[PDB]
Design a protein around this ligand. Structure first.
Ligand code: CLA
Ligand code: CLA
Ligand code: CLA
Ligand code: CLA
Ligand code: CLA
Ligand code: CLA
Ligand code: CLA
Ligand SMILES: CCCCCCCCCCCCCCCC(=O)OC[C@H](COP(=O)(O)OC[C@@H](O)CO)OC(=O)CCCCCCCCCCCCCCC
Ligand SMILES: CC1=C(/C=C/C(C)=C/C=C/C(C)=C/C=C/C=C(C)/C=C/C=C(C)/C=C/C2=C(C)CCCC2(C)C)C(C)(C)CCC1
Ligand SMILES: CC1=C(C/C=C(\C)CCC[C@H](C)CCC[C@H](C)CCCC(C)C)C(=O)c2ccccc2C1=O
Ligand SMILES: CC1=C(C/C=C(\C)CCC[C@H](C)CCC[C@H](C)CCCC(C)C)C(=O)c2ccccc2C1=O
Ligand code: SF4
Ligand code: SF4
Lengths: 83, 80, 741, 38, 146, 59, 119, 119
């Protein structure tokens, strides 16, 4: 059934770049939607047991990033329905 | 096996055979009734014993009686 | 295409067929040679899809019966407005709502029962309302008794329009099937006309009645200096003082200067701390949002002008590869059978009613609703139980569609029967999820039960013991704390005070407190996940095995309400698709009994109660949940034993009718069990041994006295199990919280 | 004509009659309440 | 009813207040109030979130016995042909799965026949009933005394 | 609502013209209901643009 | 399974590609010329015989009882005759002399390996 | 059908049973090498002696306490079922080598996790 498992990475630029340059200031991210996450993973990446439930820019930009990323890669498989 | 015995009230109106979903009961030409028919149960090894015959047995009291006997593979009616 | 084709003068309106009971079914007009004709007179009285296969005559019968239902609903609501008018203390309640307990029904003075007339203040006694009608009326802006008499009168007038309506639509103007299968128009008028104009016109009522009136009552004016709702529309000068945006007229609306309507309409959320309810500015703005959004939503169905969809060209385009055929067939499924539509509409109606229950405890939408806790309680509880039963009707009427109106020709390789191709893999993983959740939702209670009983309280699942803090609920609850500044940008307060900031105290009574969810509430949520998955197991087993199981490979031939097949296959009692609905009603009583027992005890420990000076806190049970919900001795002691003290000591007082509806509802509960455990092969010749005692005295009844049938004899066991078991919790709840709230 | 035949059925007569005997008891217990004698 | 009556007669004699019986036993909330609701108080305090005592066996057993009793209803109310077509889902799922289709049954899995099922539901009704009331006699009198 | 220099009716008629441009594409018959449907859609798009241009940003 | 249990192989022929319903569940394609169908148990197979025969003419049909040693049997039809129709070849077994009214009491069958109806 | 593809077939194929040929002692020693390493886990952190210095030793005695019971179930199932002597895991001798492999490999997994809880 999975006839065309061609590419995945086209969704990534398809989801980061559509949310990076829109800032939309007064929310959690005063910067863009993805810069407020990729900036907020390198503080925690080098073996940090922190990041509690009050850690807004990590935990919130986990779900609000992956819920569009999942949908846009699923629609990337819908991007092999016209084949 | 469920011993199905068919007594002499069986006036041969064939709701037993048409009611049984297993073809354990057939009709036998028997010159003792008005219709000349009386059911038989040869293949009681396939008999489930669901007593759907005794529902549709329009005799006085139940020409066909289904005695619940042994329980083999087929008579238990399990799928696997 | 779309047109209206209606037969006129169809059925004569004589009383002739009333003299033939059981005229309707050709299998039943034989006359009663047994008493089972009596009961089958009633179970076949609404098998409209089993009188005659002609869908036109069926569809006329049902569509005319709907107006009978709405006739009873308008008689009922006109009853509520008249009992609010004549019998209630509503005008007195409107003076001080936090002191006067709401009551309408004033019990007639016969032997003793005048003690049921509770002195609820207002200079007049009577049994206390817990339905919360007065909070709906203060939100409506009903000032004096005259609008209740007039609205009850209009309730009778609409009841007459529904009686004359259904009479007019079965007999002397009844439509064809081509009128009924016009479903793009039916959605096109319900999404827009019913719901759209309902919410829009209700926004008109709230803005031009409720906003000035519940601004004047928010100022605290007695209902004498308040003018008529009427008198706000004759001149804007009585509303321009209250909201200066009415001075600009509709000119800022049509110029799209909708910043100017910030006085009338806003997005605040939270709760008004004076009245304890929602801001009616938010609620009127809300119904404008449903108004524009539903009126937009109506126009997606092409009817006459070639503009819009049809359901067919939508469903056929979802031809996904894991289903193969896609939804090819469902528009012929859902426009020929009514039980399928009843399954969908009952499922979504019941789940909407549960959504109603949650959104009424945690965002109390009526003024002074969360300050009289019984109306706060039971409006949660009641919309749960119709919120429950209407789901099982789904599991009934999705089963009936699979038995009666299923057709494999129209329904070949689509999304529907490809489920039935692997219904063993459906029901088997529901089976696994039920056992996994049962161990991990109830074995934790046996565990903490034993660990508290074995003394080793360190080995429990308490706060102090092995903690099971619900991580996700606390996290997204914290997102809702961080709503009104971050993401709901133009908000001011949170979506509720069940999420975020400090509690709301209205008249020394706690409106809503931020609910903390820790390590006991976790396990009750896994109860709810568990007992929802069991009813989903029984009601998907009752639909997927409705027609051709691998045990009995002809249930479509046997029917829907057949009892069984027989003792063969080792016994096949209680095997029909009806019987899974029979079991889903018990598990309905379980699942909702622990939904409301989770409610009425976590919100007597973590929300409700009173406050004293310096912001001090005092719940009704006093924080006695998280140390006590983790066991069952803590559950049965601290809730079902300790909360009984205001039900059981209620004799001599005004709550004593509940003390009668507590005992007798135990009775009916246990009286159900006689119908559940025994069977008609006992009762039939017990009865016939009594028929000997009538034949001896020539008191032989002509209608021969059979016992009940099997499906009846178990259906009555459900219908007493639920009336008895539900009315126990009914009288226990209302007898509990009226003695406090 | 047939309306009285509907009013002669089992539940309608049972309610017009048990409504009547219930009215005998309720009206006979307002007029003579607390009747433990006789 | 014999032993509720005897036991509530002698919890009035042994306490001493015979008037507590004779005033509050002629109606049913006298029983469910003055006998079941009050004399289960030293039972159901068998262990608390403050500790426990010697009655913590019986207060456990009590709860245990309710779990026996209502499991009886699962066999008494809900009869076989539900389960006989549910064991087919379990045996389908066991046959079809990997790593367990090796471990096959010898006796074929079959739901309990409807004489056994009514019997085992009766047995849980008895064991649940009698263990609940043996918990309440002993925890009640051992809670008001000893 | 002021005249031809840039205001709210300036940015409604362009949304209505691209709306009726959609009506030329979405079952593009030249009948009445192209106008009554499609000018209504560009009217929805217009109202969704105008206040959205009014809330976050200069008009 | 097919390694230890009897698989019932219903074979039949038709005229048009109609659509029947499996006893497993869900619709089947119904090959028009001639088609077999391996099934589990006999009630499924004769329930399919009622599924087809009460709809339309489907005759010259019968299950070959595949038992795992390999050979077949002939169920249903047995004698080119429909079972409620009377053929003068079926020899009756399973009858007694009278009704239940002359069956012996089980205190006469007690401690003997007989049945309560044998006479 | 679905969930029977070649990734499923290739992954289930090289399992410690469905793979082609291993001595049943080592075929069971791989099974116990997984399971006995596994079962130290939910007795150290959550057991009754999780607060003394017998956090780790109670994992051994408890887990091997499960292991001898599980091999007892292995020997029951090979005692009752698998009556033939086809020398593989469907035999008696191959099954008791599978059970002895599960015992020695499982206790080896328990002691391996115990000595690897040193760090
Ligand atoms: C926009 C017009 C409109 C409105 C407001 C309704 C409203 C309703 N329809 Mg309905 N319907 C419509 C158009 C409309 N329909 C069309 C065009 C069709 C054909 C496709 C149908 C076919 C249809 C069926 C088949 C059924 C309904 C039902 C219902 C009721 C649902 C119960 C409810 O919500 O209680 C809330 C109740 C109210 C809000 C009361 C509203 C009553 C007032 C008087 C408005 C009624 C307007 C009425 C149509 C005017 C008749 C015109 C005539 C004089 C020429 C509700 C009254 C169901 C029902 O219960 O039957 C009655 C039902 O089974 N409708
Ligand atoms: C209190 C009585 C009671 C109990 C415990 C159950 C329990 C159950 N019912 Mg149920 N049922 C009941 C009454 C009860 N029912 C009644 C009255 C009805 C009438 C309508 C039904 C109707 C019904 C239906 C229709 C179905 C069930 C099903 C189930 C099972 C759901 C899966 C689950 O929870 O697994 C977890 C098990 C438990 C929570 C039970 C407690 C076990 C503890 C936690 C662990 C074991 C204890 C201990 C360690 C044992 C070992 C020691 C011992 C050997 C000495 C579960 C066993 C479903 C089923 O059969 O399959 C899913 C199903 O379809 N029930
Ligand atoms: C801006 C208009 C507006 C306003 C003022 C309200 C106000 C209210 N709504 Mg609400 N609502 C709205 C629009 C609005 N709603 C819309 C458009 C929907 C449909 C999606 C809903 C659906 C809804 C439900 C289901 C419920 C409420 C409830 C409430 C009340 C609770 C108080 C609160 O904090 O709610 C604040 C309200 C919100 C946070 C809702 C925001 C909804 C947004 C506008 C949806 C936008 C949809 C759009 C197409 C984008 C979709 C994607 C998006 C999800 C990111 C309050 C009166 C509750 C109630 O009945 O009170 C007891 C309740 O249960 N509303
Ligand atoms: C059908 C049963 C029934 C019967 C036999 C009676 C009989 C009687 N009623 Mg009566 N009543 C009934 C039902 C009945 N009522 C009902 C249902 C109502 C409620 C509407 C009343 C309301 C009523 C009033 C208000 C009064 C009576 C009175 C009387 C008495 C008049 C002489 C008589 C004994 C009168 C009387 O004697 O009371 C002083 C009186 O004033 N009745
Ligand atoms: C079946 C058992 C039973 C018996 C023997 C009684 C007997 C009695 N009840 Mg009673 N009661 C019962 C069950 C029973 N009750 C139940 C189950 C309930 C709950 C619904 C009640 C609720 C109840 C109330 C609320 C009251 C009684 C009262 C009474 C007393 C007078 C009845 C009455 O109205 O007289 C008056 C009736 C008549 C005079 C009618 C007889 C006239 C005949 C028919 C005319 C023809 C003659 C030829 C009487 C001692 C009353 C009382 O004062 O208690 C002592 C009273 O107020 N009962
Ligand atoms: C391209 C121009 C444009 C711009 C700048 C905006 C800008 C905005 N729109 Mg918007 N909108 C547009 C076109 C535009 N819209 C169109 C064409 C439609 C379809 C009719 C909508 C429909 C729409 C809805 C339905 C909603 C917004 C809302 C919003 C606001 C917040 C968006 C959010 O939640 O994130 C923001 C000011 C939301 C809001 O809060 O409005 C203030 C909101 O609920 N817009
Ligand atoms: C089902 C619910 C449940 C749960 C979760 C627990 C959990 C626990 N109980 Mg317990 N208990 C329960 C029900 C339960 N109990 C009931 C119903 C009773 C009474 C009959 C008791 C009576 C009881 C006693 C008397 C005691 C406990 C104790 C304990 C603790 C240690 C037990 C242990 O070693 O675990 C054993 C765990 C295993 C052997 C592991 C099996 C489970 C694994 C994790 C499954 C993993 C599958 C995996 C996810 C599959 C996917 C991976 C794969 C694809 C590769 C532990 C917290 C003891 C204690 O002191 O508490 C601290 C103790 O003394 N319990
Ligand atoms: C919901 C997510 C489910 C993933 C389904 C994935 C999904 O929807 O894929 C979509 C797939 C259908 O694929 P098609 O491309 O055919 O879909 C198009 C058509 O379905 C519509 O025409 O559905 C299935 O195959 C369902 C498989 C059952 C999968 C079993 C899991 C579902 C039950 C578990 C519920 C989990 C809730 C978890 C909450 C965290
Ligand atoms: C979650 C997840 C998963 C799962 C997991 C697993 C798979 C794990 C397991 C693991 C395991 C389970 C491991 C095991 C270990 C072991 C080893 C690697 C080995 C070692 C060795 C041994 C154990 C030895 C022993 C001994 C001794 C010590 C002495 C002598 C005897 C003997 C030799 C026996 C996966 C990946 C799928 C995917 C992702 C996610
Ligand atoms: C008690 C019982 C009965 C007997 C119930 C009897 C037959 C019905 C008793 C109620 C009827 C309605 C009484 C008839 C009274 C008439 C209404 C007339 C009386 C006069 C007035 C009340 C109108 C069953 O038939 C049965 C069947 C299957 C499982 C369990 C049971 C079962 O437990
Ligand atoms: C739950 C339930 C089941 C399921 C009960 C299952 C099939 C039995 C599970 C208990 C057995 C004992 C578990 C097997 C484990 C034993 C240790 C195996 C050996 C037991 C024998 C040697 C005695 C039914 O079979 C049933 C049948 C008829 C009416 C109602 C019901 C019913 O309610
Ligand atoms: S016995 Fe009853 S059923 Fe069997 S044939 Fe004679 S009549 Fe028809
Ligand atoms: S016993 Fe069951 S199967 Fe055999 S005939 Fe009588 S009813 Fe049909």
């Amino acid at each position: 059934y999975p006839l065309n498992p061609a590419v995945i990475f086209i969704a990534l630029i398809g989801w980061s770049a559509v949310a990076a340059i829109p800032s939309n200031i007064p929310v959690l991210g005063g910067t863009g939607l993805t810069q407020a996450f990729l900036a907020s993973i390198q503080r925690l990446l080098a073996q940090y047991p922190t990041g509690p439930k009050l850690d807004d820019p990590f935990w919130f930009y986990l779900i609000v990033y992956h819920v569009g990323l999942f949908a846009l890669l699923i629609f990337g498989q819908i991007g092999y329905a016209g084949y | 096996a469920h011993t199905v015995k068919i007594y002499d009230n069986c006036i041969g109106c064939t709701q037993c055979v048409r009611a049984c979903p297993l073809d354990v009961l057939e009709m036998v030409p028997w010159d003792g009734c008005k219709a000349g028919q009386m059911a038989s149960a040869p293949r009681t090894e396939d008999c489930v014993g669901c007593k759907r015959c005794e529902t549709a047995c329009p005799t006085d009291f139940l020409s066909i009686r289904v005695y619940l006997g042994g329980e083999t593979t087929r008579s238990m009616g399990l799928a696997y | 295409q779309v047109k209206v084709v209606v037969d006129r003068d169809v059925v004569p309106t004589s009383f002739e067929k009333w003299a033939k009971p059981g005229h309707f079914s050709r299998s039943l007009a034989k006359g009663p040679k047994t008493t089972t004709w009596i009961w089958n007179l009633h179970a076949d009285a609404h098998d409209f899809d089993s009188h005659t296969s002609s869908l036109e005559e069926v569809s006329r019968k049902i569509f005319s019966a709907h107006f009978g239902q709405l006739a009873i609903i308008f008689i009922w609501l006109s009853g509520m407005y008249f009992h609010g008018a004549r019998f209630s203390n509503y005008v007195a309640w409107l003076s001080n709502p936090t002191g006067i307990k709401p009551s309408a029904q004033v019990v007639w003075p016969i032997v003793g029962q005048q003690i049921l007339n509770a002195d609820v203040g207002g200079g007049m006694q009577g049994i206390q309302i817990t339905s919360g009608l007065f909070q709906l009326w203060r939100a409506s802006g009903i000032v004096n008794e005259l609008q209740l008499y007039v609205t009850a009168l209009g309730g009778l007038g609409m009841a007459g329009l529904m009686i004359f309506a259904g009479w007019f639509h079965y007999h002397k103007a009844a439509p064809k099937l081509e009128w009924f299968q016009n479903v793009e128009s039916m959605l096109n008028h319900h999404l827009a006309g019913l719901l759209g104009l309902g919410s829009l016109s209700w926004a008109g009522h709230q803005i031009h009645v409720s906003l000035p009136i519940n601004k004047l009552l928010d100022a605290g004016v007695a209902p004498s200096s308040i003018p008529l709702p009427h008198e706000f529309i004759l001149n804007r000068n009585l509303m321009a003082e209250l909201y200066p945006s009415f001075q600009q007229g509709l000119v800022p609306f049509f110029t799209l200067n909708w910043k100017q309507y910030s006085d009338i309409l806003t997005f605040k959320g939270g709760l008004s701390p004076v009245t304890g309810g929602l801001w009616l500015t938010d609620v009127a703005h809300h119904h404008l949002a449903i108004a524009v959004l539903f009126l937009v939503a109506g126009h997606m169905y092409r009817t006459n002008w070639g503009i819009g969809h049809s359901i067919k060209q939508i469903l056929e385009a979802h031809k996904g590869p894991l289903t193969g055929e896609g939804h090819k067939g469902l528009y012929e499924i859902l426009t020929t059978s009514w039980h399928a539509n009843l399954a969908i509409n009952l499922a979504m109606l019941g789940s909407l009613s549960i959504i109603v229950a949650h959104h009424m405890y945690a965002m109390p939408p009526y003024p002074y609703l969360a300050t009289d806790y019984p109306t706060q309680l039971s409006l949660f509880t009641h919309h749960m139980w119709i919120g429950g039963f209407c789901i099982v009707g789904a599991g009934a009427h999705a089963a009936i569609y699979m038995v009666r109106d299923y057709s494999p020709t129209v329904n070949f390789n689509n999304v529907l029967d490809r489920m039935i191709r692997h219904r063993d893999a459906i029901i088997s993983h529901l089976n696994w999820v039920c056992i996994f959740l049962g161990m991990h939702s109830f074995g934790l209670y046996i565990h903490n039960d034993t660990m508290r009983a074995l003394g080793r309280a360190q080995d429990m699942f308490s706060d102090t013991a092995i903690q099971l803090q619900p991580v996700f609920a606390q996290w997204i609850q914290q997102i809702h704390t961080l709503a009104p500044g971050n993401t709901a940008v133009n908000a001011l307060a949170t979506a509720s005070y069940a999420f975020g900031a400090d509690t709301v105290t209205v008249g020394s009574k706690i409106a809503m407190m931020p609910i903390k969810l820790g390590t006991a509430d976790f396990m009750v949520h896994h109860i709810h996940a568990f007992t929802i998955h069991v009813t989903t197991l029984i009601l998907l087993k009752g639909v997927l095995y409705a027609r051709n199981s691998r045990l009995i490979p002809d249930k479509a031939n046997l029917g829907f309400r057949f009892p069984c097949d027989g003792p063969g296959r080792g016994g096949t009692c209680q095997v029909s698709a009806w019987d899974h609905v029979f079991l889903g009603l018990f598990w309905m009583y379980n699942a909702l009994s622990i939904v409301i027992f989770h409610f009425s005890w976590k919100m007597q420990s973590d929300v409700w109660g009173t406050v004293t000076s310096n912001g001090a806190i005092s719940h009704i049970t006093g924080g006695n949940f998280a140390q006590s919900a983790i066991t069952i001795n803590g559950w049965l002691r601290d809730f079902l034993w300790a909360q009984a003290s205001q039900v059981i000591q209620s004799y001599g007082s005004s709550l004593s009718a509940y003390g009668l509806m507590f005992l007798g509802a135990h009775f009916v509960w246990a009286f159900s069990l006689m119908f559940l455990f025994s069977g008609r092969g006992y009762w039939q010749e017990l009865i016939e041994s009594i028929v000997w005692a009538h034949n001896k005295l020539k008191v032989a009844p002509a209608i021969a006295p059979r016992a009940l049938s099997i499906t009846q004899g178990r259906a009555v066991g459900v219908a007493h199990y639920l009336l008895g078991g539900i009315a126990t919790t009914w009288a226990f709840f209302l007898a509990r919280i009226i003695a406090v709230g | 004509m047939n309306l009285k035949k509907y009013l002669s059925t089992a539940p309608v007569v049972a309610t017009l009659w048990l409504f009547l005997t219930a009215g005998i008891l309720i009206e006979l217990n307002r007029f003579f309440p607390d009747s433990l004698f006789y | 009813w014999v032993t509720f009556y005897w036991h509530w007669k002698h919890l009035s004699l042994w306490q001493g207040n015979v008037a507590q019986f004779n005033e509050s036993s002629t109606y049913l909330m006298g029983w469910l109030r003055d006998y079941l609701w009050l004399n289960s108080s030293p039972l159901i305090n068998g262990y608390n979130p403050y500790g426990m005592n010697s009655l913590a066996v019986w207060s456990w057993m009590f709860l245990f016995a309710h779990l026996v009793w209502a499991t009886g209803f699962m066999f008494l109310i809900s009869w076989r042909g539900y389960w006989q077509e549910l064991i087919e889902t379990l045996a389908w799922a066991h046959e079809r799965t990997p790593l367990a289709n090796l471990i096959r049954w010898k006796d074929k899995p079959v739901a309990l026949s409807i004489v056994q099922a009514r019997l085992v539901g009766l047995v849980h009704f008895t064991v649940g009933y009698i263990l609940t009331y043996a918990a309440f006699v002993i925890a009640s009198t051992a809670g008001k005394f000893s | 609502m002021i005249t031809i220099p840039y205001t709210i009716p300036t940015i409604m008629v362009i949304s209505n013209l691209v709306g009726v441009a959609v009506g030329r594409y979405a079952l593009g018959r030249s009948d009445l209901t192209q106008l009554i449907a499609s000018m209504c859609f560009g009217h929805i798009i217009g109202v969704g643009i105008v206040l959205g241009l009014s809330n976050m940003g200069v008009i | 399974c097919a390694e230890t249990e009897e698989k019932y192989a219903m074979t039949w022929s038709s005229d048009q590609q109609h659509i029947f319903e499996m006893p497993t569940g869900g619709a089947a394609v119904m090959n028009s010329g001639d088609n077999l169908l391996y099934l589990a148990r006999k009630e499924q197979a004769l329930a399919l015989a009622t599924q087809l025969r009460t709809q339309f003419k489907i005759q010259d049909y019968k299950i070959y009882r595949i038992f795992p040693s390999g050979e077949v049997q002939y169920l249903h039809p047995k004698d080119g005759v429909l079972p409620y129709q009377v053929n003068k070849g079926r020899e009756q077994v399973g009858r007694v002399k009278s009704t239940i009214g002359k069956n012996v009491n089980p205190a006469q069958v007690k401690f003997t390996s007989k049945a309560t109806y044998d006479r | 059908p679905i969930n029977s593809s070649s990734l499923t077939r290739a992954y289930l194929s090289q399992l410690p049973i469905y793979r082609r040929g291993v001595s049943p002692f080592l075929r069971g020693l791989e099974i116990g090498m997984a399971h006995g390493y596994f079962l130290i886990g939910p007795f150290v952190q959550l057991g009754p002696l999780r607060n003394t210095d017998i956090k780790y030793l109670a994992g051994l005695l408890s887990a091997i306490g499960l292991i001898v019971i599980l091999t007892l179930g292995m020997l029951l199932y090979g005692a009752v079922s698998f009556t033939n002597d086809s020398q593989d895991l469907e035999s008696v001798d191959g099954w008791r080598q599978l059970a002895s492999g599960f015992l020695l490999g499982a206790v080896g997994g328990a002691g391996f996790a115990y000595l690897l809880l040193t760090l």
